[PDB]
Protein backbone atom coordinates (compact mmCIF):
# COMPACT_ATOMS: atom_id res chain seq x y z
CA UNK A 1 0.00 0.00 0.00
CA UNK A 2 1.37 3.24 -1.40
CA UNK A 3 -0.26 6.38 -2.64
CA UNK A 4 0.37 9.37 -4.81
CA UNK A 5 -1.54 12.60 -4.19
CA UNK A 6 -1.70 16.15 -5.48
CA UNK A 7 -3.16 18.88 -3.25
CA UNK A 8 -4.14 21.92 -5.31
CA UNK A 9 -5.16 25.36 -4.05
CA UNK A 10 -6.40 28.37 -6.03
CA UNK A 11 -7.13 31.64 -4.20
CA UNK A 12 -8.81 34.48 -6.11
CA UNK A 13 -7.03 37.59 -4.80
CA UNK A 14 -9.33 40.40 -6.10
CA UNK A 15 -8.63 43.91 -7.39
CA UNK A 16 -4.83 43.86 -6.97
CA UNK A 17 -3.39 40.51 -8.06
CA UNK A 18 -3.80 37.51 -10.29
CA UNK A 19 -5.06 34.48 -8.39
CA UNK A 20 -2.60 32.37 -6.43
CA UNK A 21 -2.00 28.77 -7.60
CA UNK A 22 -0.34 26.05 -5.52
CA UNK A 23 0.08 22.34 -6.23
CA UNK A 24 1.83 19.99 -3.82
CA UNK A 25 2.77 16.39 -4.74
CA UNK A 26 3.03 13.57 -2.20
CA UNK A 27 4.16 9.96 -2.33
CA UNK A 28 2.74 8.47 0.86
CA UNK A 29 3.82 10.98 3.52
CA UNK A 30 6.75 12.54 1.61
CA UNK A 31 6.55 15.78 -0.34
CA UNK A 32 8.30 15.47 -3.71
CA UNK A 33 7.21 18.43 -5.85
CA UNK A 34 5.86 21.98 -5.57
CA UNK A 35 4.34 24.32 -8.18
CA UNK A 36 3.66 27.94 -7.19
CA UNK A 37 2.30 30.74 -9.39
CA UNK A 38 4.02 33.41 -7.21
CA UNK A 39 7.40 31.69 -6.93
CA UNK A 40 10.32 33.69 -8.27
CA UNK A 41 9.16 26.55 -12.98
CA UNK A 42 9.18 23.47 -10.75
CA UNK A 43 11.18 23.22 -7.48
CA UNK A 44 12.11 19.60 -6.58
CA UNK A 45 11.23 18.76 -2.98
CA UNK A 46 12.89 15.29 -3.30
CA UNK A 47 16.23 14.26 -4.76
CA UNK A 48 14.81 11.45 -6.87
CA UNK A 49 12.42 13.75 -8.71
CA UNK A 50 15.44 15.88 -9.64
CA UNK A 51 16.92 12.78 -11.30
CA UNK A 52 14.17 13.25 -13.91
CA UNK A 53 15.25 15.19 -16.98
CA UNK A 54 14.56 18.86 -17.69
CA UNK A 55 11.83 17.67 -20.06
CA UNK A 56 9.87 16.33 -17.10
CA UNK A 57 10.17 19.71 -15.33
CA UNK A 58 8.99 21.62 -18.42
CA UNK A 59 6.07 19.35 -19.25
CA UNK A 60 4.78 19.32 -15.67
CA UNK A 61 5.25 23.11 -15.49
CA UNK A 62 3.17 23.47 -18.67
CA UNK A 63 0.50 21.21 -17.20
CA UNK A 64 0.44 23.16 -13.92
CA UNK A 65 0.00 26.43 -15.84
CA UNK A 66 -2.79 24.97 -17.99
CA UNK A 67 -4.47 23.81 -14.82
CA UNK A 68 -4.02 27.32 -13.37
CA UNK A 69 -5.85 28.79 -16.33
CA UNK A 70 -8.58 26.18 -15.90
CA UNK A 71 -9.00 26.94 -12.20
CA UNK A 72 -9.11 30.67 -12.94
CA UNK A 73 -11.96 30.12 -15.38
CA UNK A 74 -13.67 27.81 -12.89
CA UNK A 75 -13.36 30.36 -10.08
CA UNK A 76 -15.10 32.90 -12.30
CA UNK A 77 -17.80 30.40 -13.17
CA UNK A 78 -18.26 29.51 -9.50
CA UNK A 79 -18.47 33.22 -8.60
CA UNK A 80 -21.27 33.38 -11.15
CA UNK A 81 -23.28 30.31 -10.16
CA UNK A 82 -23.57 31.66 -6.59
CA UNK A 83 -24.12 35.31 -7.72
CA UNK A 84 -21.10 36.52 -5.76
CA UNK A 85 -19.12 39.73 -6.17
CA UNK A 86 -15.83 39.98 -8.04
CA UNK A 87 -14.54 41.92 -5.04
CA UNK A 88 -14.47 38.79 -2.89
CA UNK A 89 -11.58 36.41 -2.33
CA UNK A 90 -12.54 32.78 -2.93
CA UNK A 91 -10.73 29.46 -2.52
CA UNK A 92 -10.90 26.45 -4.84
CA UNK A 93 -9.28 23.23 -3.66
CA UNK A 94 -8.50 20.02 -5.46
CA UNK A 95 -7.13 16.70 -4.29
CA UNK A 96 -6.60 13.68 -6.55
CA UNK A 97 -4.42 10.63 -6.81
CA UNK A 98 -4.23 6.87 -6.71
CA UNK A 99 -3.61 4.14 -4.15
CA UNK A 100 -1.94 0.80 -4.88
CA UNK A 101 -2.08 -2.47 -2.97
CA UNK A 102 0.66 -4.85 -1.94
CA UNK A 103 1.24 -5.87 -5.58
CA UNK A 104 1.82 -2.23 -6.60
CA UNK A 105 -1.38 -2.55 -8.68
CA UNK A 106 -4.30 -0.14 -8.83
CA UNK A 107 -6.45 -0.21 -5.71
CA UNK A 108 -8.24 3.18 -5.42
CA UNK A 109 -8.48 6.45 -7.28
CA UNK A 110 -9.97 9.72 -6.13
CA UNK A 111 -10.63 13.23 -7.43
CA UNK A 112 -12.32 15.75 -5.14
CA UNK A 113 -12.92 19.48 -5.40
CA UNK A 114 -14.00 21.86 -2.57
CA UNK A 115 -15.22 25.50 -2.78
CA UNK A 116 -14.66 27.75 0.25
CA UNK A 117 -14.10 24.84 2.63
CA UNK A 118 -17.20 22.92 1.56
CA UNK A 119 -17.30 19.76 -0.54
CA UNK A 120 -18.34 20.92 -4.00
CA UNK A 121 -18.06 17.92 -6.33
CA UNK A 122 -16.22 14.59 -6.13
CA UNK A 123 -15.66 11.61 -8.36
CA UNK A 124 -17.38 8.44 -7.14
CA UNK A 125 -15.33 5.51 -5.92
CA UNK A 126 -16.11 3.73 -9.22
CA UNK A 127 -14.52 6.69 -11.12
CA UNK A 128 -17.63 6.54 -13.35
CA UNK A 129 -20.00 9.24 -11.95
CA UNK A 130 -19.94 12.43 -9.85
CA UNK A 131 -21.40 13.62 -6.54
CA UNK A 132 -22.62 17.22 -6.24
CA UNK A 133 -23.24 19.11 -3.01
CA UNK A 134 -25.76 21.81 -4.16
CA UNK A 135 -27.34 23.31 -7.31
CA UNK A 136 -24.15 24.96 -8.57
CA UNK A 137 -22.33 21.65 -8.21
CA UNK A 138 -25.31 20.13 -10.02
CA UNK A 139 -24.57 22.45 -12.95
CA UNK A 140 -20.92 21.36 -12.95
CA UNK A 141 -22.03 17.71 -12.79
CA UNK A 142 -24.28 18.15 -15.81
CA UNK A 143 -21.57 19.99 -17.76
CA UNK A 144 -18.99 17.36 -16.82
CA UNK A 145 -21.32 14.48 -17.59
CA UNK A 146 -22.03 16.04 -21.00
CA UNK A 147 -18.29 16.20 -21.73
CA UNK A 148 -17.49 12.71 -20.40
CA UNK A 149 -14.57 13.97 -18.32
CA UNK A 150 -14.89 11.13 -15.77
CA UNK A 151 -13.47 8.93 -18.54
CA UNK A 152 -10.27 10.94 -18.79
CA UNK A 153 -9.93 11.18 -15.02
CA UNK A 154 -10.28 7.40 -14.65
CA UNK A 155 -7.75 6.88 -17.45
CA UNK A 156 -5.22 9.08 -15.65
CA UNK A 157 -5.85 7.57 -12.17
CA UNK A 158 -5.71 3.92 -13.27
CA UNK A 159 -2.99 4.55 -15.86
CA UNK A 160 -0.54 7.46 -15.69
CA UNK A 161 -1.04 7.90 -11.94
CA UNK A 162 -0.07 4.30 -11.11
CA UNK A 163 2.78 4.09 -13.61
CA UNK A 164 4.48 7.22 -12.22
CA UNK A 165 3.88 6.16 -8.61
CA UNK A 166 5.69 2.88 -9.32
CA UNK A 167 8.55 4.74 -11.00
CA UNK A 168 9.02 7.09 -8.04
CA UNK A 169 8.80 4.18 -5.59
CA UNK A 170 11.66 2.42 -7.40
CA UNK A 171 13.72 5.57 -8.09
CA UNK A 172 13.37 7.01 -4.59
CA UNK A 173 13.28 3.64 -2.85
CA UNK A 174 15.65 4.67 -0.09
CA UNK A 175 13.36 7.54 1.01
CA UNK A 176 9.93 6.03 0.22
CA UNK A 177 10.34 2.28 0.88
CA UNK A 178 11.49 2.57 4.46
CA UNK A 179 10.01 2.68 7.93
CA UNK A 180 11.35 4.49 11.01
CA UNK A 181 9.95 2.86 14.13
CA UNK A 182 8.76 5.32 16.81
CA UNK A 183 11.01 6.01 19.78
CA UNK A 184 8.71 6.16 22.78
CA UNK A 185 8.85 7.55 26.32
CA UNK A 186 6.50 8.73 29.07
CA UNK A 187 6.13 11.97 31.00
CA UNK A 188 4.27 12.78 34.22
CA UNK A 189 2.53 15.95 35.36
CA UNK A 190 0.70 16.39 38.65
CA UNK A 191 -2.69 18.07 38.49
CA UNK A 192 -3.48 17.99 42.21
CA UNK A 193 -2.81 15.95 45.32
CA UNK A 194 -4.85 13.16 43.81
CA UNK A 195 -5.11 13.54 40.08
CA UNK A 196 -2.21 13.33 37.65
CA UNK A 197 -1.57 13.33 33.91
CA UNK A 198 0.46 10.69 32.09
CA UNK A 199 1.59 11.58 28.58
CA UNK A 200 2.72 8.86 26.18
CA UNK A 201 5.19 10.05 23.53
CA UNK A 202 5.98 8.81 20.02
CA UNK A 203 8.90 10.53 18.27
CA UNK A 204 10.66 10.36 14.94
CA UNK A 205 8.52 7.80 13.09
CA UNK A 206 7.63 7.23 9.41
CA UNK A 207 5.08 6.79 7.80
CA UNK A 208 2.80 9.14 9.77
CA UNK A 209 0.23 6.48 10.63
CA UNK A 210 0.28 5.35 14.25
CA UNK A 211 -2.12 4.19 16.94
CA UNK A 212 -1.68 5.22 20.56
CA UNK A 213 -4.02 3.67 23.11
CA UNK A 214 -4.15 3.73 26.90
CA UNK A 215 -5.02 0.77 29.15
CA UNK A 216 -6.11 0.68 32.78
CA UNK A 217 -5.21 -2.71 34.28
CA UNK A 218 -5.09 -3.96 30.66
CA UNK A 219 -8.53 -2.63 29.66
CA UNK A 220 -8.95 -0.10 26.86
CA UNK A 221 -9.46 3.48 28.01
CA UNK A 222 -11.06 6.28 26.05
CA UNK A 223 -12.47 8.21 29.02
CA UNK A 224 -10.25 11.06 30.20
CA UNK A 225 -7.89 10.66 27.20
CA UNK A 226 -6.51 13.33 24.86
CA UNK A 227 -4.85 12.59 21.50
CA UNK A 228 -3.13 15.47 19.66
CA UNK A 229 -2.75 15.77 15.91
CA UNK A 230 0.31 14.12 14.42
CA UNK A 231 2.94 16.74 13.64
CA UNK A 232 6.04 16.93 11.43
CA UNK A 233 9.51 17.18 12.91
CA UNK A 234 10.96 18.86 9.80
CA UNK A 235 13.33 15.95 9.13
CA UNK A 236 10.88 13.73 7.23
CA UNK A 237 9.67 12.01 10.45
CA UNK A 238 6.62 12.72 12.62
CA UNK A 239 5.72 13.10 16.30
CA UNK A 240 2.61 12.31 18.32
CA UNK A 241 1.45 11.96 21.91
CA UNK A 242 -1.60 10.85 23.92
CA UNK A 243 -2.47 11.78 27.49
CA UNK A 244 -4.64 10.32 30.25
CA UNK A 245 -5.81 11.74 33.62
CA UNK A 246 -5.05 9.17 36.36
CA UNK A 247 -5.64 9.05 40.15
CA UNK A 248 -2.50 9.95 42.11
CA UNK A 249 -0.76 6.81 43.25
CA UNK A 250 -2.25 4.70 40.45
CA UNK A 251 0.18 5.72 37.69
CA UNK A 252 1.68 2.23 37.52
CA UNK A 253 -1.76 0.74 36.81
CA UNK A 254 -1.77 2.46 33.37
CA UNK A 255 0.05 1.32 30.23
CA UNK A 256 0.46 2.94 26.84
CA UNK A 257 0.36 0.91 23.58
CA UNK A 258 1.96 1.98 20.29
CA UNK A 259 1.03 0.32 17.00
CA UNK A 260 3.08 1.16 13.95
CA UNK A 261 4.00 -0.33 10.63
CA UNK A 262 7.62 -0.44 11.81
CA UNK A 263 6.64 -2.56 14.83
CA UNK A 264 6.02 -6.30 14.33
CA UNK A 265 4.53 -6.33 17.88
CA UNK A 266 3.02 -3.26 19.54
CA UNK A 267 5.12 -1.45 22.15
CA UNK A 268 3.99 -1.17 25.77
CA UNK A 269 5.04 1.68 28.05
CA UNK A 270 4.88 1.63 31.86
CA UNK A 271 5.39 4.30 34.47
Amino acid sequence: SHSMRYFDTSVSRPGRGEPRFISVGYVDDTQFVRFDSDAARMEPRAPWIEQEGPEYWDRNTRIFKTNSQTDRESLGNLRGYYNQSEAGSHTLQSMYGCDVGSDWRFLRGYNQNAYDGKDYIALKEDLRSWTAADMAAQITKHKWEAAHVAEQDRAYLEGTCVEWLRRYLENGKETLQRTDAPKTHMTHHAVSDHEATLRCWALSFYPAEITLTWQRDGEDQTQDTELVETRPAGDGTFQKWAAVVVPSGQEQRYTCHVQHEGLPKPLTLRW
Partner: peptide, 9 residues
Protein backbone atom coordinates in the same frame (compact mmCIF):
# COMPACT_ATOMS: atom_id res chain seq x y z
CA UNK B 1 3.14 13.43 -12.66
CA UNK B 2 0.30 15.99 -12.80
CA UNK B 3 -3.02 15.33 -14.46
CA UNK B 4 -4.16 17.92 -17.00
CA UNK B 5 -7.57 19.46 -16.22
CA UNK B 6 -9.24 20.24 -19.56
CA UNK B 7 -12.67 21.44 -18.49
CA UNK B 8 -13.96 24.41 -16.54
CA UNK B 9 -16.34 24.00 -13.66
Amino acid sequence: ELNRKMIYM
